[model samples]
Target: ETPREKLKQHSDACKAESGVSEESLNKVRNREEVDDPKLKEHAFCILKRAGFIDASGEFQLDHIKTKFKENSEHPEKVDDLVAKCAVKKDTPQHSSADFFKCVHDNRS
Candidate 1:
């Protein structure tokens, strides 16, 4: 299967085992115009499954920055993405869910 398909399968199986509900997974699967806490939940699952994040949904900024380095030559690229998704007042905290949203927003 294609990588996308494999990723989907992994996501599907993970969600199934976690009891996350098919409807919820399908809502954000293969789509980008999604919002949280659904967005966060989905992102958390994908990242954790892929090992980009841990069980706590946390990852190292430098490690994540390295993943994006191929697209940009500047270090500020990380800052830009982080700044774009940085939690403001009344916004989600700077947790894995929020960080995942940031990466998703800036994904190529």
Candidate 2:
């Protein structure tokens, strides 16, 4: 599946699963960052679905690498982005948000 569609599919399911508010979704869509817990949970769910995160909530950087190499035209940049962004944090939930935030912050 296309990345956008996969994201859409996961976002809907994760939104429901996490019980995050519409406002949170809107904030992210608007490229606005917020420190809401449910929003972070939503991120984790999406990453989990995307295979970036596993059943034990550990980051699978190889999975991310493969996907980016498959989909991104800028392979070198994507490699850098994944290496720099797909990282661990204090907790799995925190890690998800951190990863997302890193991608957001460093995006071209």
Candidate 3:
């Protein structure tokens, strides 16, 4: 029902789907840039479940627009981030990486 619950649910689903281990998620939570391809796959799955991108890899721009706008004060920043980050990067794994890296880079 809640975002946290949804994300955690997706986390578990992605683990099963990606064959990712708990250690990779632990590394992510610890803020360590983990080097596992499966980690990226897990991350990508989570974002997809979060409505960031569709099954075809197209971004749901309004979802992100509303997501950041309602969650943060810097609603204006969403456009810039979406324009640059919400693009196809060959694979969903790389696309999520691009978006996550952009989110980290463009701090509110």
Candidate 4:
């Protein structure tokens, strides 16, 4: 399966296991398109819809390297946290407000 597919699967698993419902993994599954603001917006919308988080403004695009221990055991678990918190948006230039807007705008 492609990387995006893998991400989608990971998201699904995260939702099933944790209380956080799965976001629209299909939207930004492909990291390649994540560079686009519009696409990232679509991705964040899925998370908001799933109730994974509140307004995107409150969320932070934290780096996994910082939160998880360096090369710690059970890397998969840490990776999952990183993926869920990272916020599916372009790395830089994208403000929390912009990302949150994407999610809020989509929620009717």
Candidate 5:
């Protein structure tokens, strides 16, 4: 499959597995200008839906780091893998949605 195909597949699987609606996913994917609370919720939902976040709604940074590390070809460079989703001040503060968005953006 092509890169786009792979991304689409990952996206579809995440959405279905996460049980988050396409509308909510699209809002996050489109970078909607909602309030901090809603954005955080959205991020949490997306991450949870993607199985990156646990059922307890805990943002497991280490799990994310490990997952990314395993996903990368250079498995030894976990730091670099984690850094791929580094948060910027310009985006919403304390929103994993931001990081998740970063990961999705980088994927393409």
Candidate 6:
């Protein structure tokens, strides 16, 4: 697949395996910057719907990744990854115990 196709596939796979939905995550990730108020609102709604946040608060972009690094990495691709992974600032960092618990919980 081409680069765009690969990105789409990764985004889709991320959506399937993670809490984020493909469409909304794509929109948020593809944006230039967090400049537009409407986009911010939309993204907030999307993440809340995905259960990553609650009605009382929204996720922080810093937790997952920084917003838009131009030359540090694959500019477009990394941006997308960061956008998808971000969580609220106050959300506790995942613990080793939590990791184990999640693995155990998901075990079948």
User: Which lDDT values do the candidates have, in the order given?
Assistant: 0.54, 0.70, 0.69, 0.41, 0.54, 0.37
Residue 17, model 3: Cα distance from true site in angstroms: 6.5
Model 1 C-alpha lDDT versus the unseen true structure: 0.54
Per-residue CA lDDT of candidate 1, range 17-88, in tens?
Answer: 445454554654455565535445555566566555555434555566666666765656676676454444
| Residue 76 of model 3, lDDT score | 78
Q: For residues 1-108, what per-residue lDDT tens digits would candidate 4 score against the true structure?
A: 446655453345333333322243343443333234444444444545544445534443344234354555644544444544345444322443244333222323
Where's the lowest-lDDT run of ten residues in candidate 6?
95-104
Instruction: State which candidate, 5 or 6, has the greater lDDT.
Output: 5
Instruction: Single out the weakest 10-residue window by summed lDDT for candidate 4.
Output: 99-108
1-108, model 2: which lDDT tens digit per residue? 446654454456665667876557567655555767787887787777777777676777777767767865667766777777766776776687776666555644
Off by over 4 Å in 1: 1-8, 13-35, 72-75, 79-94, 103-108
Q: Report backbone clashes per prediction.
A: 0, 0, 0, 1, 1, 1
- Please give the ranking of all candidate structures by TM-score, highest first, separated by commas: 2, 3, 1, 5, 4, 6
Per-residue lDDT tens digits for candidate 3, residues 1-108, read 446655454466666667767666566555546677776787788788777887787767677767767877667777777777787677767787566656654534
Which window of 10 residues has the lowest lDDT sum in candidate 5?
86-95
Clashes of 3: 0
In model 6, residue pairs whose N, Cα or C atoms come closer than 3 Å (at least 3 residues apart or on different chains), thus clashing, are: 60-88
- Steric clash pairs (candidate 3): none
lDDT of 4 at 65: 32
Lowest lDDT 10-mer window, candidate 2?
A: 1-10
Candidate 3 whole-model C-alpha lDDT, 0 to 1: 0.69
- Of the candidates shown, which would achieve the greatest TM-score relative to the real structure? 2
Off by more than 4 A, model 4: 1-34, 60-75, 79-108
Across residues 1-108, which tens digit of lDDT does each residue of candidate 5 receive? 436555453335433444444445566555444333544554655566566656554455677787777656866645654555554333332446666556554444
